[PDB]
Amino acid sequence: SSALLRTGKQLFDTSCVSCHGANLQGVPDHGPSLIGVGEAAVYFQVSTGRMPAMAPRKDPIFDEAQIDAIGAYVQANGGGPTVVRNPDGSIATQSLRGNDLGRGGDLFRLNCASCHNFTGKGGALSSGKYAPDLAPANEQQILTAMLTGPQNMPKFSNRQLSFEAKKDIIAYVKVATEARQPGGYLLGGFGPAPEGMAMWIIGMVAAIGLALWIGARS
Amino acid sequence: GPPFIKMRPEDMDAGGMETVFPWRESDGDGTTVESHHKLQEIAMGIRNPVMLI
Amino acid sequence: PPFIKMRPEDMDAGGMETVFPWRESDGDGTTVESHHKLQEIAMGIRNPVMLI
Ligand code: HEC
Ligand code: HEC
């Protein structure tokens, strides 16, 4: 367990010691100290492919339950928020899903929609980094990422937001994106700029083609 | 529950972003018609919202 | 309260009144939902009844 965690984090020197130190001290030049964040931070930052880079999402590195070992190691090193687990030894998947939607939608439009999007797609920020799309997001990582406060994202405490609020938020997020749009083909969830592009590229072309077919050139 | 609840200094984080609105305790919670209408009026105000970081 | 209950003694041999269904489960006109329920009771074409 703890020894296996040390093996998979420090003895597996490919991952930890090259940026944060064997004792999780934190080299000031490259990364942070990494001493006050709990196992949830590690679980989110590892299971979503945001692995050490040269940082957009990529394939995960550790998947064979050793993420639990890394989380145990970091939580033993220092306290912090922990992963919400199903009452059977596994991670909660549908128990986290709530029932209320109006309150969840209002909270999304009050604090979530600002950066990400109205419909949860990608959002635009300033000077490089951006807002990723929520389509490849899974609910446990959604809750853990909110509770963790990753780069450029405001950290959220469980004290200021009720657990029912998280359940409603994740329920609304999963409903909005996974539901079929009852308006035909979707156009990226953006404003009317792609709509105008589509008008100029399809309506104009077909209209002028029909005009040339009907009319004559002389 | 009341549309707005009071705020404590401990209920924040080192990088927390929140939205607050004036309360005016004489307003009261959203139970009576007058209180509900006053709460809606304070909700619909352009220059009301304030960030606290 | 917009509506109050009725007693047999509170009439006269030549008096007329207008009454509406009460349905006490709605409650008095204090909360928003009870207020809307009472108003929609008041907003009904086939509701009013004359007792003479
Ligand atoms: C320098 C290469 C690099 C290595 C190696 C690396 N990371 Fe990171 N990661 C970073 C940097 C730099 C940050 C600081 C914030 C950022 O850049 O997003 C970070 C952020 C984090 C965060 C979220 C921010 C925080 O304060 O907690 C966690 C959790 C984390 N690292 C854990 C790990 C774990 C676990 C490993 C071993 C699998 C690891 N790091 C190895 C680059 C690296
Ligand atoms: C612009 C400020 C900002 C706000 C406001 C914001 N986020 Fe984030 N969030 C970010 C950034 C930037 C990232 C991606 C950082 C990265 O990929 O390293 C992120 C990451 C995420 C992720 C992880 C996606 C993934 O694939 O890993 C989810 C889910 C998410 N945000 C949803 C939310 C929720 C829920 C809220 C409301 C609590 C929210 N966003 C509000 C900045 C913000």
In chain A, helix, strand, coil percent, each to 5?
45, 0, 55
Query: Do A171 and A101 contact (CB within 8 A), yes or no?
Result: yes
Distance CA B35, CA B26 (A): 9
Range A144-151, long-range pairs (CB < 8 A, 24+ positions): A144/A40, A144/A41, A144/A43, A144/A44, A144/A81, A144/A83, A145/A44, A145/A48, A147/A40, A147/A81, A148/A37, A148/A40, A148/A41, A148/A44, A148/A45, A148/A81, A149/B13, A149/B15, A150/A44, A150/A45, A150/A50
- Encoding tokens for residue A128? 């490089």
Cβ of C30 and B30 within 8 Å? no
Experimental method reported for this structure: cryo-EM
A170: helix, coil or strand?
helix
Residue whose entry in the numeric block shows the structure tokens 């309260």: C1
Q: Determine the residue among B18, B48, B53 to mutate to test chain A binding: the one whose Cβ has the most chain A Cβ atoms within 10 Å.
A: B18
- Encoding tokens for residue A142? 């959604």
Distance CA C32, CA C37 (A): 9
CB count within 10 Å of CB A148 equals 21
What secondary structure letter does DSSP report for C25?
G
| Residue B49: C-alpha distances to residues A9, A92, A117, A125, B8 (Å) | 46, 37, 21, 22, 18
Query: Do B50 and B21 contact (CB within 8 A), yes or no?
Result: yes
| Cross-strand bridge partners of residue A131 | A123
Distance CA A156, CA A8 (A): 29
- Encoding tokens for residue A176? 């909005």
| Cross-strand bridge partners of residue A85 | A91
DSSP string, A181-202: PTTSS--TT--SHHHHHHIIII
Ligand number nearest CA of B51 is: 2
Residue whose entry in the numeric block shows the structure tokens 């007329």: C16
- Encoding tokens for residue C37? 């329920």
Using CA coordinates, name the residue in chain B closest to A114. B17
Tell me, yes or no, if C35 comes closer than 8 A to chain B by beta carbon: yes
Q: A19 CB contacts (<8 Å, ≥6 apart)?
A: A27, A30, A31, A52
- Encoding tokens for residue B34? 């007058």
φ/ψ of C11, rounded to 5, equals: -140, -170
φ/ψ of A193, rounded to 5, equals: -65, -50
Q: A35 CB contacts (<8 Å, ≥6 apart)?
A: A24, A25, A26, A77, A78
DSSP string, A97-135: --S--HHHHHHIIIIITTTS-SSS--B--SSS--B--ST
Distance CA A142, CA A169 (A): 9
Query: Do A154 and A97 contact (CB within 8 A), yes or no?
Result: no
Query: Do A81 and A120 contact (CB within 8 A), yes or no?
Result: no
- Encoding tokens for residue A2? 């703890």
Residue count (chain B): 53
A5: helix, coil or strand?
helix
Listed resolution, Å: 4.5
- Encoding tokens for residue C3? 């509506």
Which of A72-106 are b and which e, b meaning 16 or more Cβ less than 10 Å from the residue's Cβ?
Answer: bbbbebeebbebbeeeeeebbeeebebeeeebbbe
Q: Determine the residue among B29, B33, B40 to mutate to test chain C binding: the one whose Cβ has the most chain C Cβ atoms within 10 Å.
A: B33
Chain-centroid distance, C-alpha A31: 21
Q: A98 CB contacts (<8 Å, ≥6 apart)?
A: A104, A164, A166, A167, A168, A170, A171
Residue whose entry in the numeric block shows the structure tokens 């997020």: A173
Q: What is the C-alpha radius of gyration for chain B, rounded to an integer number of angstroms? A: 13
Does the C-beta of A125 come closer than 6 Å to ligand 2? yes
Q: Is A127 left (phi over 0), alpha (psi -120 to 50) or beta?
A: left
Distance CA A92, CA A87 (A): 8
Distance CA C33, CA A111 (A): 28
Distance CA B39, CA A20 (A): 50
What secondary structure letter does DSSP report for A159?
T
Q: What is the whole-number distance in angstroms between the Cα of residue A127 and the centre of ligand 2?
A: 16
B51: helix, coil or strand?
strand
| Cross-strand bridge partners of residue B39 | none
Q: Which of A158, A155, A141 is nearest to A91 (CA)?
A: A141
Distance CA A118, CA A115 (A): 9
What amino acid is encoded at A168 in this protein? Answer: D
Q: A164 CB contacts (<8 Å, ≥6 apart)?
A: A98, A100
Distance in Å, alpha carbon of B48 to nearest chain A alpha carbon: 15
Q: What is the whole-number distance in angstroms between the Cα of residue A146 and the centre of ligand 1?
A: 17
- Encoding tokens for residue A145? 């990422």
Distance CA A89, CA A97 (A): 18
The H or E element containing residue A205 is helix A204-214
Distance CA C52, CA C49 (A): 10
| Cross-strand bridge partners of residue C18 | C50
- Encoding tokens for residue B16? 């927390």
Query: Do C52 and C30 contact (CB within 8 A), yes or no?
Result: no
